[PDB]
Amino acid sequence: SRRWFHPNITGVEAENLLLTRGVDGSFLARPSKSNPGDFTLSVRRNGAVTHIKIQNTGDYYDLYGGEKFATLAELVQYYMEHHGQLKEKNGDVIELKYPLNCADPTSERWFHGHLSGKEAEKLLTEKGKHGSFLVRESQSHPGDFVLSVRTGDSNDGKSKVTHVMIRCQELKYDVGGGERFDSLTDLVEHYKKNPMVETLGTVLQLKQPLNTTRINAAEIESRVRELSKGFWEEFETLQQQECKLLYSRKEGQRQENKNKNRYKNILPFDHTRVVLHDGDPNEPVSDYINANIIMPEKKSYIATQGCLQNTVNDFWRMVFQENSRVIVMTTKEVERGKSKCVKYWPDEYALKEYGVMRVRNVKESAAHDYTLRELKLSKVGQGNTERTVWQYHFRTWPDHGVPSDPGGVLDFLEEVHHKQESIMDAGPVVVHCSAGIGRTGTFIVIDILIDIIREKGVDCDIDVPKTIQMVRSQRSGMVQTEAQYRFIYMAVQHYIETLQRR
Numbered sequence: 001s002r003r004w005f006h007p008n009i010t011g012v013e014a015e016n017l018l019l020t021r022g023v024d025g026s027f028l029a030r031p032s033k034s035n036p037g038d039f040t041l042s043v044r045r046n047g048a049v050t051h052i053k054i055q056n057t058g059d060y061y062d063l064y065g066g067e068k069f070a071t072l073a074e075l076v077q078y079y080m081e082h083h084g085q086l087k088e089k090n091g092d093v094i095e096l097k098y099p100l101n102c103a104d105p106t107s108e109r110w111f112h113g114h115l116s117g118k119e120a121e122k123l124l125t126e127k128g129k130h131g132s133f134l135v136r137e138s139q140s141h142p143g144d145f146v147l148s149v150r151t152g153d154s155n156d157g158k159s160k161v162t163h164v165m166i167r168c169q170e171l172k173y174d175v176g177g178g179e180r181f182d183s184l185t186d187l188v189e190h191y192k193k194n195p196m197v198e199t200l201g202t203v204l205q206l207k208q209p210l211n212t213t214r215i216n217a218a219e220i221e222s223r224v225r226e227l228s229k230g231f232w233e234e235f236e237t238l239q240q241q242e243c244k245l246l247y248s249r250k251e252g253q254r255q256e257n258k259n260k261n262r263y264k265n266i267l268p269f270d271h272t273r274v275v276l277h278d279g280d281p282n283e284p285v286s287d288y289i290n291a292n293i294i295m296p297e298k299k300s301y302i303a304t305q306g307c308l309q310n311t312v313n314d315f316w317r318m319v320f321q322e323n324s325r326v327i328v329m330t331t332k333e334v335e336r337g338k339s340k341c342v343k344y345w346p347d348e349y350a351l352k353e354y355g356v357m358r359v360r361n362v363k364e365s366a367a368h369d370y371t372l373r374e375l376k377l378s379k380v381g382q383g384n385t386e387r388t389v390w391q392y393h394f395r396t397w398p399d400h401g402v403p404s405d406p407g408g409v410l411d412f413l414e415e416v417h418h419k420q421e422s423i424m425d426a427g428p429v430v431v432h433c434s435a436g437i438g439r440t441g442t443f444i445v446i447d448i449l450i451d452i453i454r455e456k457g458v459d460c461d462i463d464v465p466k467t468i469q470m471v472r473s474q475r476s477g478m479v480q481t482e483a484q485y486r487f488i489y490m491a492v493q494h495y496i497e498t499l500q501r502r
């Protein structure tokens with residue numbers, strides 16, 4: 001669970017909560033209400049509260065005096081299982097022992113707040129299915145709530161909508177009897193596990209929240225208009241779901257693999273990692289690269305980090321093994337004086353050996369937003385293994401935030417798409433930035449969404465947060481920021497508009 005994140009709390013509200021309701025080792029995280037990408041970890045130690053800044057400019061969560069993380073849940077899991085690791089400026093250990101839980105329901109997928117009983121019945125009738133539910137404000141009884149649930153199997157009376165009144169009495173919630181809950185989430189979780197049974201026997205199964213994010217692609221402009229009045233609230237609802245994605249990353253945690261990771265705690269899930277075969281028998285662990293397969297759930301991707309000097313050979317082994325023919329690089333080699341990805345390709349017209357692999361740079365072509373490099377990759381000693389690999393190097397992404405206009409990214413992805421589609425039996429498209437989660441996740445999700453619209457036209461269903469959750473189950477923290485989340489919507493809107501004009 002992620003109850004330690006409080007989306008609508010001030011610094012002083014956080015201090016008072018930890019002092020009145022917490023103990024030493026108590027903690028919570030919260031966003032800054034005016035600087036998105038800024039978060040604070042507030043921690044109680046020696047009867048006083050310390051506030052620790054976490055910044056995310058788009059690549060990773062950077063904890064002051066700690067490490068870089070793919071998600072706030074991974075950050076919290078790391079320190080709740082590693083004492084002595086989190087430290088202040090003056091060096092003392094700060095311990096995260098006791099999450100201080102938030103009662104606020106506004107980031108729950110099932111919470112609709114102000115909503116009429118007739119509006120909720122229409123939404124549940126049109127969009128809902130057996131077990132679809134929502135919680136809304138009563139309107140008749142102020143301060144109380146209603147849980148509306150659809151149960152059932154043409155509109156022939158085989159299904160129905162039931163309303164269950166939820167009383168709020170002295171900051172606890174109940175359905176008219178039995179247990180009184182600290183929050184609506186606790187109530188919903190209880191009646192999700194232990195469903196209410198009606199007198200005549202109907203089980204009110206809370207199977208899934210009502211789906212409000214699935215839109216018809218033609219109506220993207222109207223959804224964007226609505227979110228622009230929010231994008232922040234829909235993004236935070238998505239982020240609340242990240243506690244469901246704490247999958248194991250054991251291989252990346254092995255001593256033999258530690259120096260193959262750019263950031264020690266940003267690791268590939270075991271269940272989707274790229275496994276390298278045919279390694280040097282002399283190298284004890286030769287099967288590991290910080291990379292995952294992203295299979296939308298025909299075109300697949302590999303999301304990976306920027307090469308380290310000691311992983312360039314493994315990068316080319318992956319490319320060769322997976323039969324990838326297109327690489328997308330979304331960083332300059334150096335940004336803000338820091339190395340983001342080593343040069344892993346030869347100079348134009350040059351030939352270099354990278355371990356058992358040989359690469360020729362045949363030709364480079366510069367466009368305004370990117371450079372294309374036509375590379376020839378083969379195994380040393382085996383001439384007939386040569387294949388062309390087209391590297392698309394996006395060069396104009398800003399150092400922080402996102403492009404102001406998506407036209408450049410969309411023209412780049414169209415060209416990448418056409419190259420991939422032109423090559424018979426090409427493997428997954430490799431996409432990498434620096435950590436391989438923020439820009440990489442953004443480019444991949446845009447590509448996935450646009451691909452739907454390319455095959456099905458302007459009239460098909462898309463669901464941005466559900467697509468992002470699905471990509472996040474295959475590599476940690478894919479899509480890092482609210483700014484990238486907004487950019488994904490803007491890119492898809494711009495794509496639909498250029499398709500209508502044509």
Ligand SMILES: CS(=O)(=O)Nc1cccc2cc[nH]c12
Pocket residue numbers: 109110209210211212213214237238241465466469
């Ligand atoms: C409100 S919703 O349930 O319609 N949309 C939605 C929001 C956030 C995360 C996910 C994952 C699947 N759907 C999501």
